[PDB]
């Protein structure tokens, strides 16, 4: 049960128990997993009198490339348990690359647990610094409308979807947050761009009680407020006449909004009367809801260049920093949210995993062995190592973080990085230049509509005979199908090489399926990435999917605003 004092006391003790609890976490992981095949080749059996010593001395370090085959063995047809154990109910993807190739990472119900508990503690602490009213709400531009079923009839999943459409999510977060503005069906709407045309509109639906504005990233709020900033005369028109815009086309969300709507005209006088009075939006977040205690999101790392505009958007309202963890590993929680974003540090909750840190202290990098969590030295930057419920045992994520201080017996970390970058040559290309170029060439047909492309990805589908690629696009607005079909065609029309030619001209590989994506999914990608447990080097988004890419994959199938097979060819 989510309360204030008893839990923060338990967390305090938890961060004091740090060595014991982290140890117990390791013991919990191996006791729950003495059966892993990789562990057999490592020489494990549980117990032992030199367990920590034997684990740190006998099980080797692994990369994305080497963890790819096993979880891959887990996901496709062979619903076989391997690295962790149980064929996880959902699989996750990793930023940066695995030799340009995808990376699979298991997701467990224990992870949902990690989420509930971390959100539980952090929310209690922020409520300690920025208390909120229990009868109000919060503007959450949070999304998880997409759900995909992998090549074996097994779901693969992002942290977001695996959390929101999770069975205990509604039961789990009822006490830890301020009630959601949008109906779940609108959140889970098959069209996230218009869907949360409806998000601005829903959070905006209950402004006076919206206790805070939420997106996990500064940039999340930034494009959410550039997109908040992308619908006014229309939102007003839609809500005014009681009739939503022609922009909206999905039957479930249309049913929802129409269900909500009735024609009201004076309020119009109001929205404009306030809005542009300021010198073009300083203090915009307070302007839209005057009483939101804060703007909560990831403010360090890659969001460092987005915090200013957001700040420049949030005005005088304080900007509060976010905790760190993911579908791959959970590390730190911020329990002192009142700290501004630049100085911000986050303490690590111990039972979320078993972490180790490789020093960069020598030159670059330095041939030094991993040291304990509290064995790490203050002020130094280390490489994060993960041993958690997610299939990472003594695994190198590949990011850099600094120890600023200690919250009691558990150390404070800091992130100043960006990319986990040393790439290698791929096989989901179709040169990245070729892919980016495909998007560019096909997108102008959309640019005819006064728009710019914001993001993209792709996926190789060998379920089908013949196999067929599926290209994904994130764009600014809603348009007709004809242009999209033409876009798919051009996507095929820009894969400039002869190989593609031989293939689809023949059809040993089927026509591209263009499942155009709604706004914010790739944003969900960056968002599920910089917060992953390691360091701020988590932003190189893999452009095309080999069966082993999952987070954008969970973010692949359901929200097909439209999905088409080339009518040409």
């Amino acid at each position: 049960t989510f309360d204030m004092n008893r839990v923060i006391d338990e967390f305090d003790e938890m961060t004091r128990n740090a060595h014991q609890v982290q140890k117990q976490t390791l013991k919990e992981i191996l006791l729950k997993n003495q059966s892993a095949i990789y562990l057999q080749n490592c020489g494990l059996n549980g117990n032992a009198t030199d367990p920590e010593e034997a684990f740190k001395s006998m099980v080797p370090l692994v990369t994305d490339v080497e963890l790819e085959p096993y979880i891959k063995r887990m996901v496709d047809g062979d619903t076989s348990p391997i690295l962790t154990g149980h064929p996880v109910p959902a699989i996750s993807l990793s930023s940066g690359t695995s030799q340009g190739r995808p990376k699979f990472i298991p997701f467990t119900d224990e992870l949902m647990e990690n989420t509930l508990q971390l959100f539980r503690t952090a929310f209690a602490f922020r409520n300690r610094d920025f208390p909120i009213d229990d009868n109000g709400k919060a503007l959450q531009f949070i999304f998880s409308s997409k759900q995909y079923i992998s090549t074996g009839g097994v779901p693969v999943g992002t942290a977001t979807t695996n959390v929101y459409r999770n069975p205990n999510f509604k039961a789990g977060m009822k006490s830890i947050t301020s009630p959601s503005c949008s109906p779940d069906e609108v959140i889970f709407s098959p069209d996230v761009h218009q869907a949360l045309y409806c998000h601005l509109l829903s959070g905006i639906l209950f402004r006076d009680q919206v206790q805070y504005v939420f997106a996990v990233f500064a940039h999340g709020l930034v494009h959410a407020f550039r997109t908040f900033e992308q619908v006014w005369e229309e939102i007003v028109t839609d809500i005014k006449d009681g009739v939503l815009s022609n922009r909206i086309t999905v039957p479930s969300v249309r049913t929802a909004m129409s269900k909500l709507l009735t024609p009201n005209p004076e309020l119009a006088e109001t929205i404009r009367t306030k809005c542009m009075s300021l010198s073009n939006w300083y203090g915009l977040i307070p302007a839209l809801f005057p009483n939101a205690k804060y703007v909560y999101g990831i403010m360090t790392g890659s969001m460092e260049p987005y915090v200013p505009k957001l700040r420049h958007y949030a005005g005088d309202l304080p900007l509060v920093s976010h905790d760190y963890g993911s579908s791959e590993g959970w590390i730190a929680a911020n329990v002192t949210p009142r700290l501004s974003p630049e100085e911000a540090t986050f303490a690590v909750i111990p039972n979320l995993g078993y972490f180790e840190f490789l020093p960069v202290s020598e030159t670059g990098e330095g041939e030094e062995k991993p040291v304990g969590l509290t064995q790490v030295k203050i002020g130094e930057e280390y490489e994060v190592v993960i041993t958690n419920y997610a299939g990472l045992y003594r695994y190198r994520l590949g990011d850099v973080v600094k120890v600023i201080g200690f919250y009691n017996n558990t150390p404070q970390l800091k992130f100043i990085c960006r990319r986990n970058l040393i790439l290698s040559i791929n096989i989901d290309k179709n040169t990245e230049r070729d892919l980016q170029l495909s998007v560019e060439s096909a997108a102008k047909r959309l640019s005819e509509e006064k728009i710019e492309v914001i993001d993209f990805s792709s996926y190789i589908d060998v379920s089908t005979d013949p196999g067929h690629y599926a290209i994904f696009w994130e764009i600014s607005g809603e348009t007709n199908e004809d242009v999209l079909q033409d876009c798919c065609n051009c996507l095929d029309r820009a894969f400039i090489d002869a190989g593609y030619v031989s293939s689809r001209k023949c059809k040993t590989i089927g026509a591209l399926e263009l499942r155009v994506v709604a706004k914010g999914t790739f944003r969900k990608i960056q968002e599920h990435f910089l917060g992953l447990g390691s360091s701020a080097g988590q932003f190189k988004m893999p452009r095309c999917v080999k069966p082993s890419n999952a987070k954008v994959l969970q973010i692949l199938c359901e929200n097909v605003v439209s999905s088409y097979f080339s009518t040409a060819f």
Partner: protein, 214 residues
């Protein structure tokens, strides 16, 4: 050459077959007519008259877990079912007893009963599979880094997942895929791929045992 007195649809006997095949032992199969139980069967087990029965060096082993364990202890050189420490074997035993009793009685209600015990049986079976799913935390197998003792204990019910999926009208996969999936990992080895007969035979037979009595 060791003798096995067993039943082709019996899960427990199947545990024995999975063990003897899993290690590397040539062994002979004997089918037992419960109506006309063999003389060696009457002599080996005159009390329970149960299976599987493994006559080795002239002395028989009765009960499934007993035959399997007997196998692990007799030839402990290659693929050990147990972990090195007492507590690991302990987990294997606690969970094995879980598999053979509450789990087995619940499934028994599912395939062999009508009315109330079938529904209650459905509930018991589902909660049981999720608790077993939970304890496993995330283990590819059960007892150790590879094929386990309790692995042997529950794998034979994977030949019965179909009958429960049809009789219980539940999908033990969509509600707990990881367990059935655990079973299809184990199916890739030839021990279960050759010890346990076809699933359809078991669902049909179970339907026939239902046909025979009310």
């Amino acid at each position: 050459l060791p003798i096995l007195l067993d039943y082709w649809p019996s899960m427990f006997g199947m545990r024995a077959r999975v063990a003897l095949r899993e290690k590397g032992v040539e062994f002979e199969y004997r089918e037992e007519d419960f109506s006309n139980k063999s003389p060696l069967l009457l002599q080996s087990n005159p009390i329970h008259k149960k299976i599987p029965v493994l006559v080795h060096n002239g002395k028989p082993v009765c009960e499934s877990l007993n035959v399997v364990q007997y196998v692990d202890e007799a030839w402990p050189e290659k693929n050990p079912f147990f972990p090195s420490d007492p507590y690991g074997r302990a987990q294997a035993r606690f969970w094995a007893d879980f598999v053979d009793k509450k789990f087995t009685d619940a499934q028994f209600k599912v395939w062999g009963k009508k009315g109330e015990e079938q529904e209650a049986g459905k509930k018991e079976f589902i909660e049981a599979v999720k608790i077993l799913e939970s304890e496993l935390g995330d283990k590819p197998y059960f007892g150790g880094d590879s094929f386990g003792y309790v692995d042997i204990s529950l794998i034979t019910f994977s030949s019965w997942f179909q009958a429960y999926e049809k009789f219980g009208n539940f999908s033990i996969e969509s509600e707990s895929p990881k367990l059935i999936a655990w079973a299809k990992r184990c199916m890739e080895k030839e021990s279960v791929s050759k010890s346990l007969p076809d699933s359809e035979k078991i669902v049909a037979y179970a339907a026939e045992y239902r046909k025979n009595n009310l």
